[PDB]
Amino acid sequence: KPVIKMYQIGDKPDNLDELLANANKIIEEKVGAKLDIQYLGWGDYGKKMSVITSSNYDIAFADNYIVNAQKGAYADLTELYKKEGKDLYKALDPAYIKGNTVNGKIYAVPVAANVASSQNFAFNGTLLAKYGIDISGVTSYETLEPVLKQIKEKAPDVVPFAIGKVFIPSDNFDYPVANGLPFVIDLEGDTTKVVNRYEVPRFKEHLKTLHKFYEAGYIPKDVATSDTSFDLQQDTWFVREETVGPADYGNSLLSRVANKDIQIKPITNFIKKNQTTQVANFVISNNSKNKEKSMEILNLLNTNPELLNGLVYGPEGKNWEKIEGKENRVRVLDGYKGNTHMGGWNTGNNWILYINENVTDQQIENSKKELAEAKESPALGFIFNTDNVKSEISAIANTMQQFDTAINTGTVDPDKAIPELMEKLKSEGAYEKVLNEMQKQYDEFLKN
Ligand SMILES: CC(=O)N[C@@H]1[C@@H](O)[C@H](O[C@@H]2O[C@H](CO)[C@@H](O)[C@H](O)[C@@H]2O)[C@@H](CO)O[C@H]1O
Ligand SMILES: [Br-]
Question: What is the dihedral of CA 262, 157, 343, 380, to 10 degrees?
Fold first, then answer.
């Protein structure tokens, strides 16, 4: 009975022992293995894993998937999916296959959740109710400014907009590769061309908007170095940006974890793309000596309702109880409020998850409506080939790192800093080389 070492992003729940104890009860019974989760934290998960990958594990939360897949850091899963992961493979929307297949080979166990999703303003309804601030005209950042002014007056001690050092203005863009290049596909523009986000006149606008937010104090002054969370349960923040999807049932899940009414406002379109498919992938180590077992566990994580909810909702009777009368329905208790559970988006199949009392019958109907009506990005399945430009990438992803954080967070004036970035980029030659190559492959992708 071997021990399976799984690396996970984020902070560990306080009841982790209890969480694995009841989990292993089922896992051992059906697999004969013992899962061990080591959380690695948030802020520097990218670097902390890079050490492990460079320097032995079994399962891991995938950091920069597409890149580390072409290098051979991830084990092949095509044959495992034909046996130990046959069940979970059947429950997967084909778009997950489109997005996580590199060189006719898949290395990921994508968590079946929001395969399509939009970026949203999540509002604190406790602060919305108390001051009656009108969020009816908010369709962008530009329209979010007036609403930030009000909360700054009525509640000076609350952070209006709560963002961090990872913040980039969200738009209707498509990243064939990022991290960490400024190359997008403008889904509101020429869908055939690959462009620079800083040359898109409306994204430059978001930057102006966010610099005004900085100057006005709607944004934490130390935002360029701030990597801190704002627990949704706490009224430290007024509004934040979130990825919201069908497996969340609108603001049902948001209002649940926050233990208060959370209102949401779309700022991007609802679409199926690589980014949405690769948002939460699980991989198995190249050097993993329990590969066949690792898939047998990622299977149980995505196919067993009891096992999954025992981690996502937490212990039964403490954090939740079942609703007698209606099947597949539960209600969270007092035990749920706090670090006593995991997140569903990065643990397993969001569909075998029980549904909480606060989800309306219209919220389930809308999760069926959004699902079926979900449109696909023309670049979905477009995995960029880096064989020719592996080092021309790191030249650009270096010039960016020297400037992008201060810019994307609005700390500096885009009118002065954006030309600095461009000139240093265009002076190189790796810019035009990767730009052309990217356009060249994308042409062949739409040519077919
Ligand atoms: C509230 C909740 O559980 N929401 C999840 C989203 O977080 C998730 O989006 C991701 O969120 C993480 C951390 O905030 C971030 O690192 C990712 O870039 C991504 O934005 C979403 C994914 O479909 O699923 C929701 O349920
Ligand atoms: Br534009």
Answer: 70
Q: What is the DSSP string of 13-79?
A: PTTHHHHHHHHHHHHHHHHS-EEEEEE-BSTTHHHHHHHHHH---SEEEPSSHHHHHHTT-B---TT
Alpha-carbon span 238 to 256, nearest angstrom: 17
What is the rounded distance in angstroms from the CA atom of residue 274 to the CA atom of residue 265?
Answer: 23
Sign of CA dihedral 189, 196, 95, 352: negative
* 389 CA → ligand 1 middle, Å: 31
d(CA 323, CA 358): 12
One-character DSSP codes across 356-408: ETT--HHHHHHHHHHHHH-EE-TTTT-PPP-TTTHHHHHHHHHHTTTTHHHHH
Residue 386 contacts residue 340 (beta carbons within 8 Å): no
Q: Are 226 and 302 in contact (CB under 8 A)?
A: no
Query: Of all helices (H) and strands (E), which one includes residue 309?
Result: helix 305-312
For 141, the token pair is 């950042």
Method: X-ray
If 0-12 CB within 10 Å is exposed, 13-18 middle and 19+ buried, where does residue 423 land? exposed
> Which ligand gives the minimal distance to the CA of 343?
1
Residue 219 structure tokens: 């944004």
CB 332 within 8 A of CB 319: yes
Ligand in nearest proximity to the CA of 206 = 2
Which ligand gives the minimal distance to the CA of 190?
2
DSSP track, 176-196: SS-SS-SEE--TTS-TTS-EE
Judge whether 113 and 371 are in contact, CB under 8 Å. no
Q: In this structure, which residue's CA is closest to atom 17 in ligand 1?
A: 279
Ligand 1 neighbourhood includes 248 CB (under 6 angstroms): yes
CA atoms of 428 and 417, how far apart (whole Å): 17
279 CB near ligand 1 (under 6 Å): yes
Angle at 325 between CA 322 and CA 328, to 5 degrees: 50
Distance 130 CA to ligand 1 centre (A): 28
CA–CA separation, 262 vs 241, rounded Å? 12
Resolution (A): 3.0
Q: CB–CB of 78/255 below 8 Å? A: no
Task: Name the residue of 96, 254, 279, 341 whose CB sits within 8 Å of the most ligand 1 atoms, as the mutation to test its pocket.
Answer: 279
Pocket test for ligand 1, best of 61, 243, 268, 367 (most atoms within 8 A of CB): 243
Distance 146 CA to ligand 2 centre (A): 22
How far apart are the two ends of the chain, measured CA to CA in Å?
49
Look-up of token digits 């793309």: 273
